[PDB]
A paper describes a structure:
A branched, bi- or tri-antennary, high-mannose type carbohydrate chain ((GlcNAc)n(Man)n) is N-linked to Asn394 in each Cε3 domain, as seen in previous crystal structures of [name]-Fc and Fcε3–4 at different resolutions, and with varying degrees of disorder.
The other crystal form, P21 ‘large’, with two molecules (four chains) in the asymmetric unit, has been reported earlier but is now solved at 2.0 Å resolution, the highest yet reported for any Fcε3–4 structure. In the Fcε3–4 P21 ‘large’ structure chain D, a terminal mannose residue, Man949, forms hydrogen bonds with main-chain atoms of Arg342 and Ile474; Man950 forms hydrogen bonds with Thr492; Man947 forms hydrogen bonds with Gln494. Hydrogen bonds mediated by water molecules are also formed between: Man948 and Ser341, Thr357, Ile474 and Thr493; Man949 and Arg342, Asp347, Asp473, and Ser475; Man950 and Thr492. In [name], the more extensive high-mannose structures have the capability of reaching the Cε4 domains, and the Fcε3–4 P21 ‘large’ structure reported here shows how the terminal carbohydrate units can be stabilised and contribute to linking, non-covalently, the Cε3 and Cε4 domains in [name], even when the Asn394 loop to which it is covalently connected is relatively disordered.
Numbering used by the authors:
A (entry chain A): 336 to 424, 428 to 546
B (entry chain D): 336 to 366, 369 to 422, 428 to 544
C (entry chain C): 335 to 362, 369 to 421, 428 to 544
D (entry chain B): 336 to 363, 369 to 545
Amino acid sequence: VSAYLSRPSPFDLFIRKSPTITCLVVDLAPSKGTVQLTWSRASGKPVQHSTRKEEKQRNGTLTVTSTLPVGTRDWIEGETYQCRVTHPHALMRSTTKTSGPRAAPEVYAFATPEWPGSRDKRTLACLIQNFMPEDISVQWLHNEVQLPDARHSTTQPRKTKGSGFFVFSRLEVTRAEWEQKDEFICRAVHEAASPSQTVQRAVSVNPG
Amino acid sequence: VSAYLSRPSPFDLFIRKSPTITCLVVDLAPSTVQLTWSRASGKPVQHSTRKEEKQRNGTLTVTSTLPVGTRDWIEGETYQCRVTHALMRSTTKTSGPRAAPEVYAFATPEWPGSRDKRTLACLIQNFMPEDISVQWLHNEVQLPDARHSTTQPRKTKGSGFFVFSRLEVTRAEWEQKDEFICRAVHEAASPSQTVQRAVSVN
Amino acid sequence: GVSAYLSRPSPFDLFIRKSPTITCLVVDTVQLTWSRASGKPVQHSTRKEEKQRNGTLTVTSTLPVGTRDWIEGETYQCRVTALMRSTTKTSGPRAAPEVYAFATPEWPGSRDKRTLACLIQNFMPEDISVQWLHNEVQLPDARHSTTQPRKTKGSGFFVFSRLEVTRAEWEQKDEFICRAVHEAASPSQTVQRAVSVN
Amino acid sequence: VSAYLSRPSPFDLFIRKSPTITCLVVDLTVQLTWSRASGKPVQHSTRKEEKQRNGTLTVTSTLPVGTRDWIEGETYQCRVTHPHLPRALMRSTTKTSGPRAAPEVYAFATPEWPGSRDKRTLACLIQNFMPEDISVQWLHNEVQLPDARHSTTQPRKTKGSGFFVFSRLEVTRAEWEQKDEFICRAVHEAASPSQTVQRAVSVNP
Ligand SMILES: *[C@@H]1O[C@H](CO)[C@@H](O[C@@H]2O[C@H](CO)[C@@H](O[C@@H]3O[C@H](CO[C@H]4O[C@H](CO[C@H]5O[C@H](CO)[C@@H](O)[C@H](O)[C@@H]5O)[C@@H](O)[C@H](O[C@H]5O[C@H](CO)[C@@H](O)[C@H](O)[C@@H]5O)[C@@H]4O)[C@@H](O)[C@H](O[C@H]4O[C@H](CO)[C@@H](O)[C@H](O)[C@@H]4O)[C@@H]3O)[C@H](O)[C@H]2NC(C)=O)[C@H](O)[C@H]1NC(C)=O
Ligand SMILES: *[C@@H]1O[C@H](CO)[C@@H](O[C@@H]2O[C@H](CO)[C@@H](O[C@@H]3O[C@H](CO[C@H]4O[C@H](CO[C@H]5O[C@H](CO)[C@@H](O)[C@H](O)[C@@H]5O)[C@@H](O)[C@H](O[C@H]5O[C@H](CO)[C@@H](O)[C@H](O)[C@@H]5O)[C@@H]4O)[C@@H](O)[C@H](O[C@H]4O[C@H](CO)[C@@H](O)[C@H](O)[C@@H]4O)[C@@H]3O)[C@H](O)[C@H]2NC(C)=O)[C@H](O)[C@H]1NC(C)=O
Ligand SMILES: *[C@@H]1O[C@H](CO)[C@@H](O[C@@H]2O[C@H](CO)[C@@H](O[C@@H]3O[C@H](CO[C@H]4O[C@H](CO)[C@@H](O)[C@H](O)[C@@H]4O)[C@@H](O)[C@H](O)[C@@H]3O)[C@H](O)[C@H]2NC(C)=O)[C@H](O)[C@H]1NC(C)=O
């Protein structure tokens, strides 16, 4: 049995201004009975109502999730939020905003050339590197509209040669999409980015 | 304490081909509530997902969503949700006359004080049975569900049903492309179980 | 058990007829008693019992209230004989309703009937009365349906109203009126829109 | 106490033709014993145990395996026994089954970023291959660059049935000035005929 507590996504925190944190509890057996996830703030001040979700996995695991809305000013000013896991057959996790040097991300967008026999599709790629810390949100937009999250896949932050991190994002598109409008935007949201914590670059397929 | 059990979304059933059913329990006072799925035939059920939320008025709203087999549902299996704390709800595919929906899409003229926004309205009516999904598209791409609101199906004066859908749009959207689509997914719609109408702000 | 509900006056009764009433509805010798927060006396109320199809017993008490008393913010209470419900005018900001009326085009194979739709939106508070008129004669309530007020993306509310009309009606006069009654509507709490089938 | 058993790298298996596998024991006196599912003999293995700065001891054993033995489907077994553990840990490894598909390879060069006039980042997209095992080499001056010069992401599913990785390599001005050609080479069992697919890229046109 292991538990994890995440920080707010930069998109939710800075753009949407509705940050949430998630207590993710993975139960191995799972022992009979209901797990309890209890939220608190280090200050002892009130917390909002949380959402709870659980589902039995294919391999037999019970996965439990609790998502807590947090105040925007509360989080940025350094509040510590705590998740307590209770199971009869005690785990404590906490989260607060990281401290340390900040660095904005570099962003680059690319499009693959045509692969023989696959005329109706291309792969778009985005390199986002040299940012600090590793918390970052990546989105893809078409027609100034964000595409669904499941359309793309973004790698985990790996360390660069020095202090910074990098991620790669991949988005498969169709010929119908780029013929409707041949411009796609990779957008990164990061605490150290400027202005408005947003950095974005565009790419076009430029078909023959 | 009341319980509800919904049939699959026509969009999930006919387009996504991954239908689900949802058991919703609304409880006035908290005390855990168990929601057990079973089939009238006795055959196995898949793993369901469970959600809980304490609402602003202090109520434990509990939802459980169960994937069902596509053929199993169309062939007419009956599924039961049993609530232990005993409430029993069942659901199955409707049987009876079918009628395709009529779709009408409208745009409001400019109102004083709202220069940069219009409201689109969609009237879908005279369909049978009542199960229907309503979607809005722009640039032939579906908008997020939160952008619009849709009423629950209600009886017409005759034998069909009607729903209204509302979508607020911005000047930036209709300037980029002045065409919005109200699309309905319904089992009787032909072809492809879908019928749609376009509307422009002009 | 039982649920008890207490409603506010309809804007049509409050502003046009100037004869507002509030209704205490209890759903199953049940007793319903009225009182005011100020301690002033209440008027005589009307009690009504009806048997529902499912067998449940429905009891209502309808109390006339003063026009100035309600608008100035009096609180009225219905005590059920354990149960207590209160009602008062909703405070907060005001906004007048926008009214838009629409007519469906002729649908294939349905030449002798047509559907009118009225969208009323961005008003607050949510209390609103919706009427349909033909030749300045108010049509019976059962001819139309109106949704319950729901939040827009902003602060105001919206409702949809639906009226099926006949060929005989629009041949006699092809003009129908969607009328809304609302506290913030100016100057006499009424805004309306005309619509034609063709 | 957990145990992990790896497969050989495609580079070791197909280019160098000297494959090895590694049995890793974490959170642990531990004994690691190798055997083959066929019953045929194993070679000598090398052992290295290193105490970690979080209270954990790790033991690593690397076993050389036959090239044809592995390609023809031998199963290798690592069994962990220790007094503290009640039940012995058993792990096995064999080549991945299932359909095969060669990788597509694409190589890009970033434009200049402010404050980095003397360096560029190269990126290689390798996608739609299966199974997921893959190696990447970068070549300059007709020879291979050291492995620590680049980083490759973990294999991830495409929308279809294949996998993709990205490979990242930072190059210096002196390198592309000396010769402006860099080669991203993928090593994969489904790449025909020599288990390699490569693409060249230049910093400037
Ligand atoms: C304290 O606060 C809480 C929080 O607000 C509050 O909890 C609510 O309690 C009420 C109690 O009545 C709940 O209301 C009920 O909800 C039932 C579930 O509705 C869902 O399922 C509907 C069926 O879906 C099928 O059909 C559609 C259409 O064909 C299809 O698309 C679907 O895919 C599926 O096949 C569905 O229609 C409905 O959707 C409406 O709401 C969603 C909300 O997001 C919206 O997105 C939709 O556009 C649409 O507007 C929803 O998904 C519902 O079945 C039930 O309806 C009964 O009553 C009506 C009355 O007219 C009848 O017409 C109907 O036939 C049923 O008999 C009823 O509406 C409500 O769900 C709770 N809220 C939440 C969030 O759970 C407490 O009450 C509060 N406590 C107090 C006040 O004391
Ligand atoms: C205390 O500190 C110790 C460290 O001192 C720490 O120990 C770690 O424990 C975690 C527990 O999960 C270990 O993680 C597992 O590692 C498995 C081994 O695979 C890794 O190592 C491979 C061999 O590395 C050698 O070679 C490389 C260069 O070749 C060199 O840099 C190394 O130093 C070493 O010499 C390596 O090849 C492998 O990378 C390949 O594979 C991954 C995919 O797994 C791919 O993404 C890579 O691109 C590359 O192709 C990898 O780095 C690993 O198999 C295993 O992964 C499975 O399990 C996890 C969960 O269990 C799943 O998430 C995953 O998907 C797989 O199913 C897992 O990641 C870690 O290796 C230990 N590290 C060390 C140094 O021992 C403790 O955890 C700390 N805490 C405690 C309480 O003790
Ligand atoms: C049985 O199957 C289960 C489901 O497949 C397995 O559960 C998985 O267990 C792993 C590790 O035990 C979890 O991985 C962790 O993920 C969290 C969070 O990752 C997500 O959130 C971050 C930030 O919020 C986001 O950036 C990522 O993209 C993810 O969306 C990490 O913090 C951990 O370090 C770790 O990587 C899986 O999340 C978990 N899956 C589920 C569905 O719960 C289980 O391990 C299997 N068990 C056996 C015995 O086979």
